Design a binder for this molecule. Structure first.
Ligand SMILES: O=c1ccn([C@@H]2O[C@H](COP(=O)(O)OP(=O)(O)O[C@@H]3O[C@H](CO)[C@H](O)[C@@H](O)[C@H]3O)[C@@H](O)[C@H]2O)c(=O)[nH]1
Ligand SMILES: [Mg+2]
Length: 333
């Protein structure tokens, strides 16, 4: 696909196929074989491709303070919006009924499984594609019209993937493994009680297309200082995930992270050490760098320089471009 793009850029770069493909960020990374044939019939053929429909799904519990700004941010850009309420005790449903009558409201007991609630929306959705957003997110106005173009180009090339907008924390931390959107063609389901993500039902990990969409995330802003509250909820769920895979370094990391967020640094260090130990021979090393960086932060703060040296050396070996290595090195000499 990077080849096809290089020629679409060269050979006349004002085709609607050119623009729309440029919404995709990590094109260089997509390695499945697309039979390059002739950019001419490809350009022309795109013009007649169908513009897929997209459902926007929101799972909600007690979001009175936020749901209106959230829905105002998505009200223009989706064929269908489904809100799945877990029997809120605040006035969440009534705000939606009043100000967003075209939103479909469905109800479902919370079962302490974020993947169950999301998959419930997938069952209810009638569009060709789904995109999930949370009540403490804002969909950027600059996204106007783009999410359907993304889905159009992906259907065109029959790319099986999930789709990640950039999500910006209040901190300015920018995430690109967010996996919020995918085609509703019976291939992808959410898996996990917490920290859930959409998996092929053989439980393999879909390719992740990063796209030039932006979503703001207010949910850990000190405006609402919900930090410790959301954290205690998630750690009870992370603990269940860990029981089922007590050697999984990803779950060990998330548990350590949440112990740390709950001012339990002692207790975090042991889980992070075991996570880092188990990551060496693990296939999905996505959070290996975050485990190392967090552990080095904790050891540094506790003046445990001897152990900090051990993990900083591992950090720099595995991730020589890590932007945090120089900081730790400067703090101990
Ligand atoms: O019992 C609940 C709790 C939460 N939500 C909704 O789930 C969403 C995400 O919950 P949130 O308050 O934002 O916790 P966060 O810590 O900000 O992250 C979230 O952590 C969750 C669990 O992994 C989410 O699914 C992820 O999208 C992640 O961004 C919200 O729209 C909530 O209203 C429910 O529907 N029912
Ligand atoms: Mg949130």
């Amino acid at each position: 696909l990077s080849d096809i793009y290089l020629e679409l850029k060269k050979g006349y770069a004002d085709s609607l196929l050119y623009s729309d493909l440029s919404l995709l960020v990590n094109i260089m990374e997509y390695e499945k074989d697309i039979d390059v044939m002739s950019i001419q019939s490809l350009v022309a053929g795109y013009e007649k491709s169908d513009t897929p429909t997209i459902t926007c799904g929101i799972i909600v519990y007690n979001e009175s303070k936020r749901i209106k700004k959230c829905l105002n941010s998505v009200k223009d850009d989706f064929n269908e919006i489904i809100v799945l309420d877990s029997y809120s005790t605040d006035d969440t449903v009534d705000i939606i009924k009043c100000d967003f009558p075209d939103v479909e409201i469905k109800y479902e007991k919370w079962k302490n499984d974020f993947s169950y609630a999301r998959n419930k929306i997938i069952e209810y959705a009638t569009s060709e594609w789904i995109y999930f957003i949370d009540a403490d997110n804002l969909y950027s106005k600059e996204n106007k019209g783009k999410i359907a173009k993304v889905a159009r180009v992906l259907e065109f090339f029959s790319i099986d993937c999930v789709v990640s907008p950039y999500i910006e924390e209040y901190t300015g931390h920018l995430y690109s493994d967010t996996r919020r959107m995918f085609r509703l063609n019976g291939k992808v389901k959410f898996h996990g009680k917490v920290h859930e993500e959409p998996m092929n039902y053989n439980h393999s990990l879909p390719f992740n297309f990063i796209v030039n969409l932006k979503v703001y995330h207010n949910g850990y802003n000190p405006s609402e200082n919900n930090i410790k509250s959301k954290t205690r909820r998630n750690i009870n769920l992370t603990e269940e995930m860990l029981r089922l895979e007590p050697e999984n370094p990803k779950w060990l990391f998330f548990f350590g992270r949440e112990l740390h967020l709950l001012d339990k640094d002692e207790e975090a260090i042991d889980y992070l050490k075991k996570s880092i130990n188990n990551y060496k021979k693990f296939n999905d090393q996505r959070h290996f760098i975050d485990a190392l960086v967090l552990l080095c932060t904790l050891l540094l703060q506790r003046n445990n320089y001897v152990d900090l040296t051990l993990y900083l050396d591992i950090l720099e070996t595995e991730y020589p471009r890590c932007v945090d290595v120089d900081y730790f090195r400067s703090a101990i000499l």
